[PDB]
Amino acid sequence: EKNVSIVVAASVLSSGIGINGQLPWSISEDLKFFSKITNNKCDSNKKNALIMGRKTWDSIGRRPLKNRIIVVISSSLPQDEADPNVVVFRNLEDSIENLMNDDSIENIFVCGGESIYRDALKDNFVDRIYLTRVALEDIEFDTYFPEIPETFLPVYMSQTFCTKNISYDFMIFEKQEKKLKSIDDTVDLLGEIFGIRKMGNRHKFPKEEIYNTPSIRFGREHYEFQYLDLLSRVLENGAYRENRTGISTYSIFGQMMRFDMRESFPLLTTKKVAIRSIFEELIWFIKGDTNGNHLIEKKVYIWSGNGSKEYLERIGLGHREENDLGPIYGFQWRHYNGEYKTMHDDYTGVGVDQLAKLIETLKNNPKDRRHILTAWNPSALSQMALPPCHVLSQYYVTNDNCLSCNLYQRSCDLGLGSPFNIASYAILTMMLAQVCGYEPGELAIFIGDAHIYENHLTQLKEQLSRTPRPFPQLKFKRKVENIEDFKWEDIELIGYYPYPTIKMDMAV
Amino acid sequence: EKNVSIVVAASVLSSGIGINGQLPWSISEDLKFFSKITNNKCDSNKKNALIMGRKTWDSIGRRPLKNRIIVVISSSLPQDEADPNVVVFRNLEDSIENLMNDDSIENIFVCGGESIYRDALKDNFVDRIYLTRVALEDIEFDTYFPEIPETFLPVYMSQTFCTKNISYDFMIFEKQELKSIDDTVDLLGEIFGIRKMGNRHKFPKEEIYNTPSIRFGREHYEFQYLDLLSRVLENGAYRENRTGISTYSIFGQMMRFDMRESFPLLTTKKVAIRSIFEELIWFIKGDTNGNHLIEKKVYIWSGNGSKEYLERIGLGHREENDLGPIYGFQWRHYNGEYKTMHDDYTGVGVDQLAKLIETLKNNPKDRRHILTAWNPSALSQMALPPCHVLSQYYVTNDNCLSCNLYQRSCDLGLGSPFNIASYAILTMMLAQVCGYEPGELAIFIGDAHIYENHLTQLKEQLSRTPRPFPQLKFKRKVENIEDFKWEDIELIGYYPYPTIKMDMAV
């Protein structure tokens, strides 16, 4: 009655595992994971059994694996008794007799090609699945991993790792069966006595119907959950509130999201995100530009709503040209406190250049605690087409020469602005890291008013029904001299396999 | 084999539970907690047994409690068989016969005065302890709860609640006697050294974790500060800075505090609340004169405002304590041309605080209640750049005022407790002037660090189990936010641990 687990590394979409008798990739850390998970035992006087098919036995050179016993399933191989570390069986059913007569075997691992995988799943021999999702799909496969049956549920999904620009995950699946202690009861009783006087009741845990992949309870390591859980928390505790637009929101206050940038790029996979528009807006900020037409001329329409004749006249800026957004992010980054006139004037030399001072300080005094870039200028708020949402950012150089970023966001549209903000400040930190000579670190986003617009409810709930996939990789094709020299052609997005786009309208 | 639990409400320091045959307090929610915890059962055809002494049986009027069976320990009361809800036993040992006989009893609760408590603990009959710590100590007691034996460890400590300006907690004590997900995470952590972000955010070891036995019940929001200390001690990188005292630093941290039922003033260390208030009202008035704080026996800005320090950072033209345009000058005169600490600035710059107050009561659901202090044009003139850089304020649907604060650099030994209390008081001041109630306080930290000369001190502070937060009330309602005085502040139920001396790094 010992445990039987599948160990497999398959592609993220088509679940390919092999091609021409070998693997479609070469990931060293994945093999180490196979080695450590198949050697993991509890009894020093027992060994683990690794079951594999004959063709898989050929692909590993027909040589034994240390500290383990390999069980080859073959109809033609001679049942040789010379090697005690390799044993041959004529069928998979007869091979699963290490449970009974062989008390010297502690755990059993199935890992031997499509034929053995499919037979082990069809006959319900498998209890656990150790899946390594690999972000490679536009290549050739001839051997696939079977679709995981509905009797299995995911219980763990690791963060995204990177090897030679290849993104990969680690997941565990458990086969469902039938059907502290008093701390939960005491907390529930306290919540019944104190209604909303108990702060726990104002931060209720999301219900299962709005929880992304609810079967993953204690292993929600993938940092896309940092965004999906915020959606669920809003759906559970968001107060219905009006705002300056005609579209009400469900809002909560004081939230946090954390993302890794060392081994992945925080571009959401549960929805296809317009990465090009994000980059074009970011380089538009860096150049100090406030002319909205330059984004529209590059097929980027995210600032069209807040820069129309009707919207500008409504907020009392009818004197402006159609897309003259005024002194905003790009103008406070390069010309802070500069007297703004129009989008056509020359501002070279005006205001404080925070971005230049930031870059100079990052490489000359890295351990300084004042790497701050702000956009909140109370003297210029009335002239802006929209006050800053990503208000302030701080940057940090670790001891191992990595650049981390903290961002405070006063207002967060979780449907549209939030994924853009995550990717935008990830790219910005990477740009600062390359110009200053560091590596990307971490990205923390601290949110004030985190809200969901009521016309996004059907869409975001749809997005919550999609299990996340490994984050992609973002690499720069060339090293630039000035941070303003980055071009969209210099960006390489590797291994991005998202779910279909989800259309959502912006509230003007 | 059946469960035996003590339910008791005792004072926070002396563990007093009674006076003159009655309770030393009147907390309605505590009685409701007693009712819910003693009625909590699993079988609908069973009842719970409440064991109490005779004097306690007298104090409750000698009347039965619904749905439960009261067991009175007395040597004189007649063993009457008329009332089935009240049964009398001659001693506590013989009374613990609900274990073997009477299968109709599911759980057993001991709750009957000092004599029964002490006997139940001395004979090792008790498995669990439900303690309600009450923040009342300068009153008279004649009945005390025994000192909890070392065989018990706390497993839960609730947030601080308030009833009639009385702070109280809820704790659980236990007597000491997935699966493969943790293994897979450990294996992945062995393969990827610090490439796995979990290894860069390691869970603190037990030796630096405050009350490590409370694992799943760290509800008390003082843990939001103590655990941050532990995280720094576990993952902090040793780094140099502008001062001669190196720190252990981490980046990107968060603390959350409740202000509806308590005031976030740390109990594991006596915090100078008066100096915090005087600094805050000094900010609100728009004052940059460091002498006005020194004249009020507040010396927190003496180090960053000396002749030697100002000359060192290139401000030798300044007067002794002319700190320059800092907190409160950017609040009241943002972008205002700063001259000296004595000039008249009435009307210059943008008054963020006034606009903030006006917007909070005229447009509460606005998403732009922002108060900033980071002025890149004035950084060179400041004696010290702002640490609490930016704050945002939020009006809930039930007319509560919450506050978010971003802090670029956080001295966890000295500045952090001051910052927590300071912005707590500021939110309360804004709430009263705008006509709201205090809400929540979230603090987002960039460079959270511990100075190396605070290591012995902070580890000492981590050895102290937290106590209920106190209460902060205003004695009068003011017309303008600048009119608050220290005499208008009432700090109720503050019973901290001894002060811990720590030197500031200049």
Ligand SMILES: NC(=O)C1=CN([C@@H]2O[C@H](COP(=O)(O)OP(=O)(O)OC[C@H]3O[C@@H](n4cnc5c(N)ncnc54)[C@H](OP(=O)(O)O)[C@@H]3O)[C@@H](O)[C@H]2O)C=CC1
């Ligand atoms: N990414 C990953 O995790 C893994 C990938 N792979 C890859 O997959 C490929 C190999 O898989 P695959 O092509 O399906 O071959 P298999 O590994 O499944 O081995 C098949 C052989 O096993 C024997 N066999 C299979 N079923 C039975 C049965 N019901 N009764 C008796 N004997 C049986 C047969 O050998 P015989 O002819 O002797 O009778 C058969 O030819 C390789 O490219 C390999 O590298 C393999 C393992 C893991």
Ligand SMILES: NC(=O)C1=CN([C@@H]2O[C@H](COP(=O)(O)OP(=O)(O)OC[C@H]3O[C@@H](n4cnc5c(N)ncnc54)[C@H](OP(=O)(O)O)[C@@H]3O)[C@@H](O)[C@H]2O)C=CC1
């Ligand atoms: N804050 C809280 O949670 C609680 C507080 N209290 C307070 O504490 C006070 C009461 O406690 P306390 O003064 O200690 O009195 P007790 O409630 O402990 O009752 C004592 C009586 O129980 C009987 N008794 C005790 N021990 C024995 C024994 N070993 N054998 C036989 N009979 C025994 C005796 O009754 P007899 O004379 O008949 O022999 C004795 O007089 C009250 O003020 C009450 O309000 C009470 C409960 C809870």
Ligand SMILES: CN(Cc1cnc2nc(N)nc(N)c2n1)c1ccc(C(=O)N[C@@H](CCC(=O)O)C(=O)O)cc1
């Ligand atoms: C059957 N097979 C193909 C193969 C390749 N990648 C996989 N990856 C996963 N996640 N799961 C599998 N079953 C798997 N199988 C294998 C099996 C073992 C070794 C191997 O060389 N293992 C060494 C690992 C060497 C190392 O430390 O790098 C060991 O000690 O177990 C290679 C391919």
Ligand SMILES: CN(Cc1cnc2nc(N)nc(N)c2n1)c1ccc(C(=O)N[C@@H](CCC(=O)O)C(=O)O)cc1
């Ligand atoms: C023995 N005793 C004194 C008393 C008072 N406060 C306490 N508080 C605690 N935490 N623990 C105790 N053992 C305790 N005991 C009692 C016991 C029951 C009631 C009582 O009236 N209980 C009603 C409560 C009525 C209501 O809902 O408020 C019930 O239904 O249980 C009062 C005092």
Ligand SMILES: N#Cc1ccc(CC(=O)O)c(NC(=O)c2ccc(Cc3c[nH]c4nc(N)[nH]c(=O)c34)cc2)c1
């Ligand atoms: N899925 C998806 C998806 C598909 C296409 C697009 C447009 C594009 O790819 O070009 C988008 N993004 C936006 O349509 C978008 C995203 C961010 C902003 C910033 C912004 C400015 N002012 C705002 N005011 C409100 N209220 N909220 C906001 O997000 C903003 C404005 C628009 C998302």
Ligand SMILES: N#Cc1ccc(CC(=O)O)c(NC(=O)c2ccc(Cc3c[nH]c4nc(N)[nH]c(=O)c34)cc2)c1
């Ligand atoms: N326990 C304790 C305890 C006991 C007494 C006092 C002083 C008093 O009660 O009056 C204190 N607080 C301070 O001594 C103190 C607290 C906060 C500051 C703000 C500050 C300005 N510049 C700083 N620079 C550094 N590096 N760090 C800092 O905290 C500050 C400066 C000093 C703490």
Ligand SMILES: O=c1[nH]c(=O)n([C@H]2C[C@H](O)[C@@H](COP(=O)(O)O)O2)cc1F
């Ligand atoms: O980068 C952005 N991120 C974002 O979340 N918004 C959304 C938040 C909110 O829905 C709206 C701002 O309206 P308000 O000023 O009332 O917060 O824009 C806008 C951006 F430009």
Ligand SMILES: O=c1[nH]c(=O)n([C@H]2C[C@H](O)[C@@H](COP(=O)(O)O)O2)cc1F
């Ligand atoms: O409110 C404050 N909080 C705080 O933590 N500091 C500490 C943080 C740091 O130890 C020092 C500033 O050093 P630096 O300018 O390098 O961030 O002041 C100062 C304040 F005024």
